[PDB]
Swiss-Prot record, chain A:
Monomer. It comes from Aequorea victoria. Contains a chromophore consisting of modified amino acid residues. Maturation of the chromophore requires nothing other than molecular oxygen. This is Green fluorescent protein. Belongs to the GFP family.
Length: 228, 408
């Protein structure tokens, strides 16, 4: 339904670059891999290029490309993410960790040549030094979530809301409340959707050849919630 | 059965019936999946005993999801099958909060009709109207404001054990913004004095009366509650001074003297009939007009008649511009309505009003009011029949006022 969607019919290389500062701890991450929107599938590896990551890897998953979600054929007219390509979109979030601090992120997601690139700046403040984040109390795993999408006509974009649930090593759950806005970078027309949702799931692993601090991610996302 | 509602299979629903409330990783039952626009599947599941109030991992019931996605008919069938109209998610949002956030007016109205709590607060104290305002949904905010005011009007009648009549009218356009018992008769009490002053001003405009004409009267004319006229027995009072006293101090002798000038209660009624108000009637003089006898049509109006007539006097062509400003100026200077709408009126607001009190718990007020120093609506409130004290009647009228101001 959009010209941008034609860019996603096959496997697309991905690069991710993040610069972060959480409670004054500065860090950087580089990721690379590929996405196949036909299956809603991402395969990525991330490396902390500054030493040990000062927050748990799972807390950064959502920050590290919803253009790779699988939109069923009957929903193609509701895929804002692909319609904004190749010029791309700005993705801004605030993530509130319950009883703890927050992340504020700004990213640009766009094609640079044949590669889909997500470049992020992240600032985190007000974290507790022995909370679940700076105390590294989160399990190395990831749950399935519902992601809720609504058009924001006045901004020519979308608003997105959801809650991430991070398992804690003691059997509790750390909630991370996500407030998100996406706006096109380009001037061409984009698809503004009716209200709908994405269903996500993610699997975290390690590369046995890798001694640096890192995360391997396999993720599947499918859009739903609109009929015919 | 979870896949049979996605991707819907309504015939499979009846075939598979199996755990009607089978769950997945996000706590979705088949009903949660079907709530996104599969009306026939929703119906099949509900018939077969699906848990209409099942909450997902975030606290969303199927009604919450139908409110978000905007499906009016699914909202309706969920409610028909006993969905909890006020179920709150983990943020404290009811379905009405969600409909107000997302701008779904038709769904707001169905939820209100089915008992949604207009005053429900989320985890941060915010009502659906608060969120409608935050999201720029002005039409929903207005609907929710009126609904909250009707909740208060009905609460007042419950507390007082008496009927309460109410109307809010747009001063410029005449549109009825909200109302309750608006075609029922209530005793006007001293609120009739605004109509008397209008008749006097009409006579002045026509050259049939002079603001400066002095009227002499005697001790025999003095009736109870005549705080200005009792002090001017020797020198008399001009028509202007009498009208001022009647409106701003509710002076009963002043009103009676002015009534005589127009042919008494029958003359005031003729003035009203001639300007098109065939409902409001005055029959008796002060103080007998306050008796409030049950089933007595004398000395009564209806909320809509009084509000419509007062609008025509204040903004219509009935009076000259100078005279309609004079009526408003006198009502603005009312001195004896403190405990009513004035008691809850915020800084900077304008009010021009006239109150009344009578026997058998009768109490009322007529007002033109608005923010930022200018009137923009007419409010009329009447009650009669209560055994409550004067303080209780005042407080209930004030609380109705606070609600209509909050929801403005």
């Amino acid at each position: 339904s959009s010209k941008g969607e034609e860019l996603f019919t096959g496997v697309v290389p991905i690069l991710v670059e993040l610069d972060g500062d959480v409670n004054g701890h500065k860090f950087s991450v580089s990721g690379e891999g590929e996405g196949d929107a036909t299956y809603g599938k991402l395969t990525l590896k991330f490396i902390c290029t500054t030493g040990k990551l000062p927050v748990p890897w799972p807390t950064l998953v959502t920050t590290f490309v919803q253009c790779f979600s699988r939109y069923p054929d009957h929903m193609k007219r509701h895929d804002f993410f692909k319609s904004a390509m190749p010029e791309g979109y700005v993705q801004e979030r605030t993530i509130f960790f319950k009883d703890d601090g927050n992340y504020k992120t700004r990213a640009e997601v766009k094609f640079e040549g044949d590669t889909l690139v997500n470049r992020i700046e992240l600032k985190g403040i007000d974290f507790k030094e022995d909370g679940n984040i700076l105390g590294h109390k989160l399990e190395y795993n990831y749950n399935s979530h519902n992601v809720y999408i609504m058009a924001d006509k006045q901004k020519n974009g979308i608003k997105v809301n959801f809650k991430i649930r991070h398992n804690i090593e003691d059997g509790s759950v750390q909630l991370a409340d996500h407030y998100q806005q996406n706006t096109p970078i380009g001037d061409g027309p984009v698809l503004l959707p009716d209200n709908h949702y994405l269903s996500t799931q993610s699997a975290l692993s390690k590369d046995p050849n890798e001694k640096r601090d890192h995360m391997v991610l396999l993720e599947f996302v499918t859009a739903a919630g609109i009929t015919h | 059965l979870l896949e049979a509602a996605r991707a819907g299979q309504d015939d499979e629903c009846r075939i598979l019936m199996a755990d009607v409330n089978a769950l997945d990783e996000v706590g979705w039952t088949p009903l949660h999946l079907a709530a996104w626009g599969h009306l026939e599947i929703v119906e099949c599941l509900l018939k077969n005993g699906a848990d209409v109030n099942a909450a997902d991992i975030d606290g969303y019931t199927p009604l919450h999801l139908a409110a978000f996605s905007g499906h009016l008919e699914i909202v309706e069938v969920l409610l028909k099958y006993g969905a909890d109209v006020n179920a709150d998610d983990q943020a404290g949002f009811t379905p009405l909060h969600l409909a107000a956030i997302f701008g779904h007016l038709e769904i707001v109205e169905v939820l209100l009709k089915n008992g949604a709590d207009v005053n429900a607060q989320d985890k941060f104290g915010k009502t659906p109207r608060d969120l409608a305002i935050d999201n720029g949904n002005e039409d929903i905010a207005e609907v929710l404001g009126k609904a909250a005011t009707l909740v208060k009007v009905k609460d007042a009648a419950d507390q007082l054990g008496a009927r309460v009549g109410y109307i809010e009218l747009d001063l410029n356009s005449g549109k009825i913004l909200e109302s309750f018992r608006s075609e029922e008769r209530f005793p006007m009490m001293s609120t009739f004095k605004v109509l008397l002053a209008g008749a006097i001003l009409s006579r002045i405009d026509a050259g049939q009366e002079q603001l400066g004409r002095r009227i002499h009267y005697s001790q025999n004319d003095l009736v109870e509650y005549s705080p200005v006229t009792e002090k001017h027995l020797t020198d008399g009072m001009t028509v202007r001074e009498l009208a001022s006293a009647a409106i701003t101090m509710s002076d009963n002798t002043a009103a009676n003297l002015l009534l005589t000038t127009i042919g008494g209660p029958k003359g005031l009624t003729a003035f009203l009939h001639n300007m098109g108000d065939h409902v409001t009637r005055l029959d008796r003089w002060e103080p007998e007009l306050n008796e409030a006898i049950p089933n007595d049509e004398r000395d009564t109006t209806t909320p809509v008649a009084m509000a419509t007539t007062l609008r025509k006097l204040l903004t219509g062509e009935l009076l000259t511009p100078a005279s309609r400003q004079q009526l408003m100026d006198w009502m603005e200077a009312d001195k004896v309505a403190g405990p009513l709408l004035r008691s809850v009126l915020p800084a900077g607001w304008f009010i021009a009003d006239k109150s009344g009190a009578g026997e058998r718990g009768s109490r009322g007020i007529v007002a033109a009011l608005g923010p930022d120093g200018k009137p923009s609506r007419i409010v009329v409130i009447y009650t009669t029949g209560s055994q409550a004290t004067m303080d209780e009647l005042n407080r209930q009228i004030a609380e109705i006022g606070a609600s209509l101001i909050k929801g403005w």
